[PDB]
Structure formats: structure tokens, C-alpha cells
Amino acid sequence: TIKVFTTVDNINLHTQVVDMSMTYGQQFGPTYLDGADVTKIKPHNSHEGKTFYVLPNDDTLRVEAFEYYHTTDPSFLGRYMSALNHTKKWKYPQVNGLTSIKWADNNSYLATALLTLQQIELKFNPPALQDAYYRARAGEAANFCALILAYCNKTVGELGDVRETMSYLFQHANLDSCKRVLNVVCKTCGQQQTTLKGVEAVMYMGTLSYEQFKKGVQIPCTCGKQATKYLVQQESPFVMMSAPPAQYELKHGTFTCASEYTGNYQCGHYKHITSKETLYCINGALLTKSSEYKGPITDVFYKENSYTTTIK
Amino acid sequence: MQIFVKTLTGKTITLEVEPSDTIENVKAKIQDKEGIPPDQQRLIFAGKQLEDGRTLSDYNIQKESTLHLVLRLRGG
Amino acid sequence: MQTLTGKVEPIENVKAKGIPPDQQRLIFAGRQLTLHLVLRL
Ligand SMILES: [Zn+2]
């Protein structure tokens, strides 16, 4: 026999005595060593003192897993470990102070999400995401990227959508206090006010322009006439304005960051535009600085705290 | 009841639905009209993303309402 | 005898005890039924 540690979270370790004539699977169920599936493997001498991830098979491991990850999905650990074996081999260059990802395995949407997360104020609820985020900001982003893939139900190499990725991650953020109040005005019907909370308070699909949302957008009224919809109140640390990709000018100092999507609905590529002392276009490991930027933009992020309209 | 769905080309689709229909059920009806696989479809109501597992009732969508159909992006 | 952001006598009844029961999911021993409240909105 040898001594090893089992874990679900790599924080709480459980000392185990393993029979060296039986596989890890027979003693622990599904078992992983640094992302590698060792379920069907017999213990090796050099495994002494090593930490193994295990699928929860008792009340202790199940509570620890839920407290760390905030999911009961029995596939989560397997999907996370499968992703981590790839994301450990990616490169995470510092690009003028932000952790990016060198292009690999169709990861441009994931790199764009990672760059955006470092520029908006967000508190993750699951300790797994809080812990991995801090490592990612320091340049050790493999665990964070593998968690993003697992939470978003994405495989390494799968094409993806930044808006969708941010939406799924926002479900695991403390947006409880985020609030949006909208008004829709029809000259016939009168005025209808809607309040949205949490994730729905920080997302919009149909215009990239925060200023246009504040000024008003024309929408159909079910009476058959056009109504005006405008933002009455916004209480959130940011907003994400999205639209189907279209040519758009990004003006220095008027936004936080943005997603550029080139290509079509079968296959495209993301770049990340950020407003610093000038405009930065981050393309994986590559950085280009320019005084102006026009391209096919699909997401724009703006800083907020509390906005109240002056429209009466 | 009937709702309208506006596509990326500006084409308006007319569907027959019930308040208890899930967003998944409305996507199935768009695939009957237009042949678009549900997994590509993203339905938007006045800027708000409608989610799988919710109902048209959950979003207070009424007769003669207009939805917008957009498509998932495929970035690598 | 005595949420994910951090906020009886021996489930429906604990749910019974402003947020309707139907939006509440309760988690004990890392399993859906310290208990954990998960919300469906
Ligand atoms: Zn009207």
C-alpha cells in the first residue's frame, strides 16, 4: 500500500491508504492526477504523497464539491479535467498588463472573455472561479480557462460565442443588486415600465451604443404603432451592449472594451479592443495600438455605477 | 395565439403558440417554417435574451408581440 | 431545532417557511432535496 490524498477542490485533502494491486477506479471511482484520467491505472511508487481528484462518492466529497463549484453536475469534474489537459499546454502572455491567450484550439472567444473579465467589476460566487481568476490575473490561467469551458458546457476546440460565455459566467456572479428600469412609451397606449434584475439587468441584444439605449430605440407596440423604449435607471458596475456583428467605429474614451467578430455564422475569429491611453487591439499574443478603430463589433462593455435618466 | 419573429434579413415570420410553450418549443416552430436548427437560434424580446426552460408566459409575451431571431456566433 | 452569495422539526415545509417554493432548490450533503438555497429565476 501507499498513502495518497483524494480531493474534489484541491483545497481539502483526504488521506487514503490504497491497495497497490487494485486500480484507482476500484478503490475511489473516477480518479485524476493533474488532469490525467488514472481510473483504470494501478498505483505507482512515485504516486506516494500525490493529490488525486475524485468524483464525489460520499456526503463529505459531495458537500465539498457543491461548496467549491456551485454545481451538482456529475459530469463537471470529468469535463473540467479533460479541458485542463489542453489548457495547461496553452500560453498566457501578458499583453500590456492583461492576461491573454496565444491562439490555439479555436480559443479566440475564450481569450476575448478572459480579457473582458479583467476589465469589468464582477465577484464570482463559486470559490473555484474566485481562486482560478486570481491565478489567471497573475498569468497562470489554465485552471480558469478549463473551468470556463466546463461551466459553459464547451469542449476544447469547439467554436464559441463571447456573449453566450459571459452570460453563463454572469449566472455564477453576484449580480443580485444589479437593476435596470426601462420605459416604453406609445402615443396611443401610454407608458409601460419594466424592472429587470441580475444578469438580465446587464445584457442587451440589438444595439452596441449605451448612449442610443439612453436616448431611445423604436420598437413595435402590439397596438400596431411604433413605441419608444429607453433606459430609465441602471444600477450595475458595467453593462454589456451586443448586436449582430456590424461595422462600427470605437471612439477612444467612450467605452471600456469590445468584441470584434470577423467571418460568418459558420466560422469566425474574435479580437478584443480596449480603450487605454489609446486604442489597443489584442489578437491572442499580438497587440496593435491605434488612435482610431473601425471593424465588425458585436459586444461593447461600458463602466457604470448608478444612472438615472433626465427624460420625463 | 400568434406572434411575429423578425429575422436578420428583415423577413417577418408568423407563428401560432401558447403562453405555456417553452422557448425550445418556439425554436421547433421556427425550424418548421425556416429549417434553422434550434441549437443555432437565439430569440430576443425587445433586447432581452429568452432562455431555454422558460415559457413565453414567464416573459409576459402576449398576442401580436414581435421577437427577433439572431444566431449564435462561431468564433475560433 | 435550528444562498450562493453567502446570505424547524424533523423539504416542502422548509420551502413553505416571499420567494415561492417553486423558485427554491435546497441542497444538503451536496445533493438536491447547513442547507444550500439555489434560486431559479
Ligand atoms: Zn400602442
Short mmCIF file of C-alpha atoms and ligand atoms in Angstrom, two decimals:
data_model
loop_
_atom_site.label_atom_id
_atom_site.label_comp_id
_atom_site.label_asym_id
_atom_site.label_seq_id
_atom_site.Cartn_x
_atom_site.Cartn_y
_atom_site.Cartn_z
CA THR A 1 0.00 0.00 0.00
CA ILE A 2 0.96 3.73 -0.48
CA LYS A 3 -0.51 6.91 1.09
CA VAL A 4 -2.17 9.48 -1.25
CA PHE A 5 -4.61 12.42 -0.90
CA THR A 6 -8.04 12.48 -2.60
CA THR A 7 -9.77 15.84 -3.23
CA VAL A 8 -12.67 17.40 -5.17
CA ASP A 9 -11.37 21.02 -4.81
CA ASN A 10 -7.55 20.76 -4.34
CA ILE A 11 -8.08 22.74 -1.03
CA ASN A 12 -9.45 19.98 1.28
CA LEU A 13 -7.23 16.83 1.03
CA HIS A 14 -8.31 13.43 2.42
CA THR A 15 -5.54 10.94 3.37
CA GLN A 16 -6.15 7.48 1.81
CA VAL A 17 -4.35 4.09 2.05
CA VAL A 18 -4.50 2.47 -1.44
CA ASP A 19 -4.11 -1.26 -2.25
CA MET A 20 -1.35 -1.24 -4.98
CA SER A 21 -2.88 -4.42 -6.63
CA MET A 22 -6.23 -2.66 -7.45
CA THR A 23 -6.81 0.27 -9.89
CA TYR A 24 -7.73 3.75 -8.56
CA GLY A 25 -11.21 3.17 -10.10
CA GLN A 26 -11.82 0.05 -7.93
CA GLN A 27 -10.88 1.94 -4.69
CA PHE A 28 -12.05 5.57 -5.38
CA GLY A 29 -14.21 5.50 -8.55
CA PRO A 30 -13.17 8.02 -11.26
CA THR A 31 -9.72 9.42 -10.32
CA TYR A 32 -7.46 12.06 -11.99
CA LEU A 33 -3.80 13.10 -11.47
CA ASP A 34 -3.03 16.67 -12.73
CA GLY A 35 -5.88 16.31 -15.35
CA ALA A 36 -4.86 12.75 -16.43
CA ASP A 37 -7.58 10.05 -16.01
CA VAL A 38 -5.92 7.27 -13.87
CA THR A 39 -9.24 5.38 -13.09
CA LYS A 40 -8.09 2.21 -14.92
CA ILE A 41 -4.43 2.57 -13.68
CA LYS A 42 -2.85 0.70 -10.71
CA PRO A 43 -0.97 2.81 -8.11
CA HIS A 44 2.73 3.62 -8.94
CA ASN A 45 5.54 4.11 -6.30
CA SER A 46 6.09 7.79 -7.37
CA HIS A 47 2.33 8.40 -6.60
CA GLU A 48 3.29 8.45 -2.84
CA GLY A 49 2.13 11.78 -1.27
CA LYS A 50 0.44 12.94 -4.54
CA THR A 51 -3.04 14.60 -4.70
CA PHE A 52 -5.77 12.94 -6.85
CA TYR A 53 -9.14 14.42 -7.88
CA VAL A 54 -12.08 12.01 -7.31
CA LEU A 55 -15.73 12.09 -8.33
CA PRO A 56 -17.73 12.63 -5.08
CA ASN A 57 -18.76 9.13 -3.74
CA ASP A 58 -19.73 10.14 -0.13
CA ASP A 59 -21.53 13.00 1.72
CA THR A 60 -18.20 14.78 2.62
CA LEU A 61 -16.91 14.97 -1.01
CA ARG A 62 -20.44 15.90 -2.31
CA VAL A 63 -20.75 18.88 0.14
CA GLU A 64 -17.14 19.99 -0.59
CA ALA A 65 -17.77 19.76 -4.39
CA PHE A 66 -21.01 21.78 -4.22
CA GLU A 67 -19.45 24.43 -1.87
CA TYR A 68 -16.42 24.84 -4.24
CA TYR A 69 -18.10 24.65 -7.70
CA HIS A 70 -21.82 25.50 -7.03
CA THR A 71 -22.97 22.64 -9.34
CA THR A 72 -24.25 19.07 -8.75
CA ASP A 73 -23.48 18.05 -12.40
CA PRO A 74 -21.77 14.59 -12.04
CA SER A 75 -20.02 15.17 -15.46
CA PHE A 76 -18.46 18.53 -14.34
CA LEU A 77 -15.22 17.08 -12.88
CA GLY A 78 -14.60 14.88 -15.97
CA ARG A 79 -15.27 17.82 -18.35
CA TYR A 80 -13.04 20.18 -16.29
CA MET A 81 -10.16 17.63 -16.14
CA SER A 82 -10.49 16.88 -19.91
CA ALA A 83 -10.28 20.63 -20.68
CA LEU A 84 -7.37 21.23 -18.19
CA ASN A 85 -5.14 18.65 -20.02
CA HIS A 86 -5.35 21.02 -23.06
CA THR A 87 -5.43 24.44 -21.31
CA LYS A 88 -2.23 23.56 -19.30
CA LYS A 89 -0.40 23.49 -22.72
CA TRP A 90 -1.68 26.96 -23.83
CA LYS A 91 0.50 30.10 -23.41
CA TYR A 92 -0.87 33.09 -21.42
CA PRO A 93 1.17 36.15 -22.44
CA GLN A 94 0.85 39.43 -20.55
CA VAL A 95 -0.26 41.93 -23.23
CA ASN A 96 0.25 45.48 -21.83
CA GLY A 97 -0.82 44.39 -18.33
CA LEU A 98 -3.68 41.91 -19.18
CA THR A 99 -3.52 38.10 -19.34
CA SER A 100 -4.37 36.95 -22.89
CA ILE A 101 -4.08 33.53 -24.54
CA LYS A 102 -1.89 32.70 -27.53
CA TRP A 103 -4.13 31.35 -30.31
CA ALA A 104 -4.71 27.57 -30.08
CA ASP A 105 -7.59 25.12 -30.40
CA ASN A 106 -10.18 27.75 -31.61
CA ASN A 107 -9.74 29.68 -28.34
CA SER A 108 -10.21 33.31 -29.60
CA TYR A 109 -13.71 33.59 -27.95
CA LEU A 110 -12.26 32.34 -24.63
CA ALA A 111 -9.28 34.78 -24.79
CA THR A 112 -11.75 37.64 -25.52
CA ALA A 113 -13.88 36.66 -22.48
CA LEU A 114 -10.75 36.35 -20.25
CA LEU A 115 -9.54 39.85 -21.30
CA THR A 116 -13.01 41.32 -20.70
CA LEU A 117 -13.30 39.73 -17.21
CA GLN A 118 -10.08 41.54 -16.14
CA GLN A 119 -11.66 44.93 -17.06
CA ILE A 120 -15.18 44.71 -15.51
CA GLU A 121 -16.02 44.58 -11.78
CA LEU A 122 -17.54 41.11 -11.11
CA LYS A 123 -17.48 38.96 -7.93
CA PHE A 124 -17.72 35.25 -8.71
CA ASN A 125 -19.81 33.21 -6.23
CA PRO A 126 -18.08 29.80 -6.60
CA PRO A 127 -14.74 29.66 -4.78
CA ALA A 128 -13.47 27.65 -7.80
CA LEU A 129 -13.91 30.70 -10.08
CA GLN A 130 -12.71 33.27 -7.46
CA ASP A 131 -9.48 31.25 -6.83
CA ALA A 132 -8.79 30.47 -10.50
CA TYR A 133 -9.49 34.10 -11.57
CA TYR A 134 -6.79 35.42 -9.19
CA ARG A 135 -4.30 32.85 -10.61
CA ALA A 136 -5.34 33.87 -14.17
CA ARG A 137 -4.81 37.60 -13.48
CA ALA A 138 -1.24 36.66 -12.28
CA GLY A 139 -0.67 34.84 -15.66
CA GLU A 140 -1.45 31.22 -14.52
CA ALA A 141 -4.80 30.98 -16.40
CA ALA A 142 -5.02 27.23 -17.34
CA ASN A 143 -7.40 26.30 -14.47
CA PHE A 144 -9.61 29.37 -15.05
CA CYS A 145 -9.92 28.62 -18.81
CA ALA A 146 -10.71 24.92 -18.13
CA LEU A 147 -13.38 25.99 -15.57
CA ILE A 148 -14.91 28.47 -18.09
CA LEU A 149 -15.14 25.63 -20.64
CA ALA A 150 -16.69 23.27 -18.04
CA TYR A 151 -19.23 25.86 -16.70
CA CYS A 152 -20.20 26.90 -20.28
CA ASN A 153 -20.57 23.21 -21.43
CA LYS A 154 -17.86 23.76 -24.13
CA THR A 155 -15.14 21.33 -25.33
CA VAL A 156 -11.57 22.42 -26.21
CA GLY A 157 -11.60 23.17 -29.98
CA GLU A 158 -15.38 23.91 -30.11
CA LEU A 159 -16.24 27.26 -31.76
CA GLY A 160 -17.91 29.72 -29.43
CA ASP A 161 -19.69 32.96 -28.68
CA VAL A 162 -18.36 35.61 -26.22
CA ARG A 163 -21.88 36.95 -25.42
CA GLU A 164 -23.04 33.37 -24.51
CA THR A 165 -19.86 32.74 -22.49
CA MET A 166 -20.24 35.98 -20.50
CA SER A 167 -23.98 35.22 -19.91
CA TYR A 168 -23.25 31.73 -18.45
CA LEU A 169 -20.43 33.12 -16.25
CA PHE A 170 -22.68 36.01 -15.04
CA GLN A 171 -25.10 33.30 -13.66
CA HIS A 172 -22.20 32.46 -11.26
CA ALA A 173 -21.54 36.11 -10.30
CA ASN A 174 -23.08 38.19 -7.51
CA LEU A 175 -25.30 40.46 -9.69
CA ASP A 176 -28.16 40.27 -7.15
CA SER A 177 -28.13 44.07 -6.60
CA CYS A 178 -27.95 44.92 -10.38
CA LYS A 179 -31.15 46.65 -11.53
CA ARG A 180 -32.43 48.05 -14.83
CA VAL A 181 -35.60 50.12 -15.29
CA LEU A 182 -36.97 50.62 -18.82
CA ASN A 183 -39.91 52.60 -20.12
CA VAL A 184 -41.82 52.01 -23.36
CA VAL A 185 -43.94 54.96 -24.50
CA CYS A 186 -46.71 54.72 -27.11
CA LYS A 187 -48.51 57.99 -28.04
CA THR A 188 -51.77 55.87 -28.13
CA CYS A 189 -51.41 53.29 -25.28
CA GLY A 190 -49.36 55.31 -22.71
CA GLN A 191 -46.29 54.15 -20.78
CA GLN A 192 -45.13 50.72 -19.57
CA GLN A 193 -42.23 50.43 -17.09
CA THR A 194 -40.29 47.15 -16.70
CA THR A 195 -37.70 46.34 -13.99
CA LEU A 196 -35.00 43.68 -14.63
CA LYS A 197 -32.60 42.29 -12.01
CA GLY A 198 -29.36 40.29 -12.03
CA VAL A 199 -27.98 39.01 -15.34
CA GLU A 200 -30.94 40.41 -17.33
CA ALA A 201 -30.13 43.89 -15.91
CA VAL A 202 -26.63 43.97 -17.53
CA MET A 203 -27.22 42.43 -21.03
CA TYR A 204 -28.85 43.85 -24.18
CA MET A 205 -29.09 42.45 -27.72
CA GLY A 206 -29.81 44.90 -30.56
CA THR A 207 -27.51 47.98 -30.26
CA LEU A 208 -23.83 48.44 -29.33
CA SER A 209 -24.46 52.04 -28.22
CA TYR A 210 -25.17 52.69 -24.50
CA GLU A 211 -25.99 56.28 -25.47
CA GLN A 212 -28.64 55.12 -28.04
CA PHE A 213 -30.26 52.92 -25.32
CA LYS A 214 -30.45 56.03 -23.05
CA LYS A 215 -31.86 58.26 -25.85
CA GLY A 216 -34.45 55.71 -27.10
CA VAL A 217 -34.93 52.87 -29.59
CA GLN A 218 -38.05 52.45 -31.76
CA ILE A 219 -39.88 49.13 -31.18
CA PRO A 220 -43.26 47.86 -32.31
CA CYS A 221 -46.22 48.37 -29.92
CA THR A 222 -48.80 45.49 -30.07
CA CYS A 223 -51.45 48.27 -30.86
CA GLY A 224 -49.79 48.34 -34.36
CA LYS A 225 -47.85 51.63 -33.86
CA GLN A 226 -44.13 52.31 -33.09
CA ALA A 227 -43.24 52.96 -29.41
CA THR A 228 -40.02 54.39 -27.94
CA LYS A 229 -38.07 52.25 -25.42
CA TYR A 230 -35.47 53.96 -23.23
CA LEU A 231 -33.34 53.27 -20.15
CA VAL A 232 -34.79 54.97 -17.02
CA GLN A 233 -32.33 53.68 -14.38
CA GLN A 234 -29.23 51.47 -14.45
CA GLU A 235 -27.56 50.28 -11.20
CA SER A 236 -24.63 47.95 -12.08
CA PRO A 237 -20.84 48.14 -12.27
CA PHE A 238 -20.94 47.58 -16.04
CA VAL A 239 -23.29 46.94 -18.95
CA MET A 240 -22.75 44.68 -21.99
CA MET A 241 -24.36 46.01 -25.17
CA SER A 242 -24.43 43.48 -28.06
CA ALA A 243 -25.69 43.34 -31.64
CA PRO A 244 -25.27 41.06 -34.67
CA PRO A 245 -21.74 41.86 -35.92
CA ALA A 246 -21.61 45.06 -37.97
CA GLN A 247 -19.07 47.72 -38.98
CA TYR A 248 -18.75 50.17 -36.04
CA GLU A 249 -16.37 52.98 -35.02
CA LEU A 250 -14.96 52.67 -31.48
CA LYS A 251 -14.02 56.13 -30.14
CA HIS A 252 -11.20 56.36 -27.55
CA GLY A 253 -12.52 57.09 -24.01
CA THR A 254 -16.21 56.26 -24.71
CA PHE A 255 -16.25 52.53 -23.77
CA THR A 256 -14.29 50.02 -21.62
CA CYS A 257 -13.63 47.19 -24.12
CA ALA A 258 -15.28 45.43 -27.11
CA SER A 259 -15.51 42.15 -29.05
CA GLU A 260 -14.66 42.24 -32.78
CA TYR A 261 -16.01 39.25 -34.79
CA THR A 262 -14.70 38.70 -38.33
CA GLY A 263 -16.08 35.91 -40.56
CA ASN A 264 -19.61 34.48 -40.85
CA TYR A 265 -22.18 32.41 -38.87
CA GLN A 266 -20.30 29.14 -39.75
CA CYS A 267 -16.80 30.25 -38.63
CA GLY A 268 -15.26 33.49 -37.38
CA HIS A 269 -12.46 34.92 -35.28
CA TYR A 270 -12.61 37.29 -32.26
CA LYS A 271 -10.28 40.16 -31.45
CA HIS A 272 -10.53 42.32 -28.28
CA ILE A 273 -10.46 46.13 -28.44
CA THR A 274 -9.73 48.06 -25.21
CA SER A 275 -9.61 51.81 -24.53
CA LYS A 276 -6.47 52.73 -22.51
CA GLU A 277 -4.21 55.76 -23.21
CA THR A 278 -5.05 54.90 -26.85
CA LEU A 279 -6.96 52.04 -28.55
CA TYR A 280 -5.47 48.53 -28.20
CA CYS A 281 -6.43 45.61 -30.48
CA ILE A 282 -5.44 42.39 -28.72
CA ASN A 283 -5.36 39.37 -31.03
CA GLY A 284 -4.18 36.49 -28.77
CA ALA A 285 -0.44 37.19 -28.26
CA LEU A 286 -0.45 40.18 -30.69
CA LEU A 287 -1.12 43.81 -29.73
CA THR A 288 -1.69 46.71 -32.12
CA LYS A 289 -2.14 50.35 -30.91
CA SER A 290 -4.13 52.89 -32.98
CA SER A 291 -5.77 56.31 -32.45
CA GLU A 292 -8.98 55.12 -34.24
CA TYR A 293 -10.67 51.71 -34.74
CA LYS A 294 -13.42 50.57 -37.10
CA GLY A 295 -14.37 46.90 -37.53
CA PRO A 296 -17.17 44.36 -37.18
CA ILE A 297 -18.09 44.84 -33.49
CA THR A 298 -20.59 42.57 -31.69
CA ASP A 299 -20.15 43.42 -27.92
CA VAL A 300 -19.26 46.70 -26.18
CA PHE A 301 -18.72 46.95 -22.41
CA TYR A 302 -19.24 50.21 -20.53
CA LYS A 303 -18.47 51.13 -16.90
CA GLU A 304 -21.44 52.13 -14.71
CA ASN A 305 -22.37 52.77 -11.09
CA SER A 306 -25.84 54.36 -10.99
CA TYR A 307 -27.51 56.11 -13.95
CA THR A 308 -30.89 57.88 -13.81
CA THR A 309 -32.46 59.40 -16.97
CA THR A 310 -33.45 63.08 -17.32
CA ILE A 311 -36.28 62.10 -19.81
CA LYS A 312 -39.74 62.97 -18.30
CA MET B 1 -52.17 32.68 -30.15
CA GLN B 2 -49.87 34.18 -32.85
CA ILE B 3 -46.52 36.06 -32.50
CA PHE B 4 -44.16 37.62 -35.10
CA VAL B 5 -40.45 36.76 -35.45
CA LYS B 6 -38.14 39.21 -37.30
CA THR B 7 -35.07 37.57 -38.96
CA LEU B 8 -31.60 39.08 -39.64
CA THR B 9 -32.64 39.74 -43.32
CA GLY B 10 -35.75 41.77 -42.21
CA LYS B 11 -38.19 38.92 -43.14
CA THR B 12 -41.16 38.66 -40.68
CA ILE B 13 -42.35 35.09 -39.74
CA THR B 14 -45.85 34.44 -38.18
CA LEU B 15 -46.09 31.56 -35.58
CA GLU B 16 -49.07 30.02 -33.65
CA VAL B 17 -48.04 29.45 -29.95
CA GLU B 18 -49.36 29.14 -26.32
CA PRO B 19 -48.18 31.06 -23.18
CA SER B 20 -47.05 27.66 -21.69
CA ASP B 21 -44.72 26.96 -24.72
CA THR B 22 -41.04 26.85 -23.69
CA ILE B 23 -38.53 28.85 -25.76
CA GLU B 24 -37.41 25.34 -27.05
CA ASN B 25 -40.97 24.81 -28.42
CA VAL B 26 -40.90 28.24 -30.29
CA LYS B 27 -37.46 27.30 -31.83
CA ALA B 28 -39.01 23.97 -33.08
CA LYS B 29 -41.79 26.05 -34.85
CA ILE B 30 -39.18 28.34 -36.50
CA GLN B 31 -37.37 25.17 -37.81
CA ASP B 32 -40.72 24.06 -39.37
CA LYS B 33 -41.04 27.46 -41.18
CA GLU B 34 -37.36 28.23 -41.99
CA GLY B 35 -35.40 24.93 -41.42
CA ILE B 36 -33.00 26.63 -38.92
CA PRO B 37 -31.69 24.08 -36.33
CA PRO B 38 -32.84 25.13 -32.80
CA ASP B 39 -29.20 24.96 -31.50
CA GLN B 40 -28.28 27.95 -33.80
CA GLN B 41 -31.30 30.09 -32.76
CA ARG B 42 -31.27 32.87 -30.15
CA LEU B 43 -34.65 34.54 -29.53
CA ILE B 44 -34.72 38.18 -28.29
CA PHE B 45 -37.71 40.15 -26.95
CA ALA B 46 -37.15 43.94 -27.04
CA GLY B 47 -33.40 43.39 -26.35
CA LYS B 48 -33.81 40.64 -23.65
CA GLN B 49 -32.35 37.17 -24.36
CA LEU B 50 -35.07 34.48 -23.91
CA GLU B 51 -33.71 31.31 -22.20
CA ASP B 52 -34.36 27.58 -22.68
CA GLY B 53 -36.55 26.06 -19.93
CA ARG B 54 -38.55 29.28 -19.52
CA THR B 55 -42.04 29.85 -21.05
CA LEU B 56 -43.49 32.77 -23.12
CA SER B 57 -45.71 33.35 -20.04
CA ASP B 58 -42.51 33.69 -17.87
CA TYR B 59 -41.55 36.72 -20.13
CA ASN B 60 -45.15 38.13 -20.30
CA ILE B 61 -45.09 37.82 -24.15
CA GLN B 62 -48.65 38.49 -25.47
CA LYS B 63 -50.55 38.12 -28.82
CA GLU B 64 -49.09 40.24 -31.75
CA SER B 65 -45.67 40.53 -29.91
CA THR B 66 -42.56 40.77 -32.13
CA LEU B 67 -39.45 38.64 -31.30
CA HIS B 68 -36.04 38.96 -33.03
CA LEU B 69 -34.23 35.79 -34.16
CA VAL B 70 -30.44 36.13 -34.06
CA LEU B 71 -27.83 33.38 -34.50
CA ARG B 72 -25.07 32.05 -32.22
CA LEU B 73 -21.55 33.16 -33.19
CA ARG B 74 -18.90 30.59 -34.09
CA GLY B 75 -15.54 32.17 -33.13
CA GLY B 76 -12.26 30.24 -33.18
CA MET C 1 -34.46 22.81 16.17
CA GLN C 2 -32.21 25.25 14.22
CA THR C 3 -27.55 31.31 -0.67
CA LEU C 4 -24.56 31.05 -3.11
CA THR C 5 -23.58 34.75 -2.45
CA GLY C 6 -23.38 33.97 1.35
CA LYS C 7 -26.79 35.29 2.65
CA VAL C 8 -37.82 23.54 12.02
CA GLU C 9 -38.70 19.94 13.21
CA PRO C 10 -37.86 16.52 11.64
CA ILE C 11 -38.38 19.94 2.40
CA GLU C 12 -41.73 21.34 1.06
CA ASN C 13 -42.37 22.56 4.69
CA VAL C 14 -38.93 24.36 4.95
CA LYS C 15 -39.69 25.91 1.48
CA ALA C 16 -43.16 26.85 2.90
CA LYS C 17 -41.23 28.53 5.80
CA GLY C 18 -41.80 35.93 -0.10
CA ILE C 19 -39.87 33.69 -2.59
CA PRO C 20 -42.37 30.98 -3.72
CA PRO C 21 -41.38 27.30 -3.05
CA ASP C 22 -41.19 26.62 -6.86
CA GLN C 23 -38.18 29.05 -7.33
CA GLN C 24 -36.34 27.43 -4.32
CA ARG C 25 -33.96 24.45 -4.75
CA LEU C 26 -32.50 23.16 -1.42
CA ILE C 27 -29.12 21.27 -1.28
CA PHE C 28 -27.94 19.11 1.73
CA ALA C 29 -24.96 16.65 1.60
CA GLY C 30 -24.09 18.22 -1.84
CA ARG C 31 -27.41 16.82 -3.19
CA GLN C 32 -30.78 18.47 -4.11
CA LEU C 33 -33.68 17.51 -1.72
CA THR C 34 -26.15 23.82 6.68
CA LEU C 35 -28.55 23.54 3.66
CA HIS C 36 -27.85 25.43 0.37
CA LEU C 37 -30.54 27.59 -1.31
CA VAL C 38 -30.22 27.72 -5.13
CA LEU C 39 -32.68 30.08 -6.94
CA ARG C 40 -34.41 29.58 -10.35
CA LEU C 41 -35.49 32.99 -11.85
ZN ZN D 1 -49.61 51.39 -28.56
#
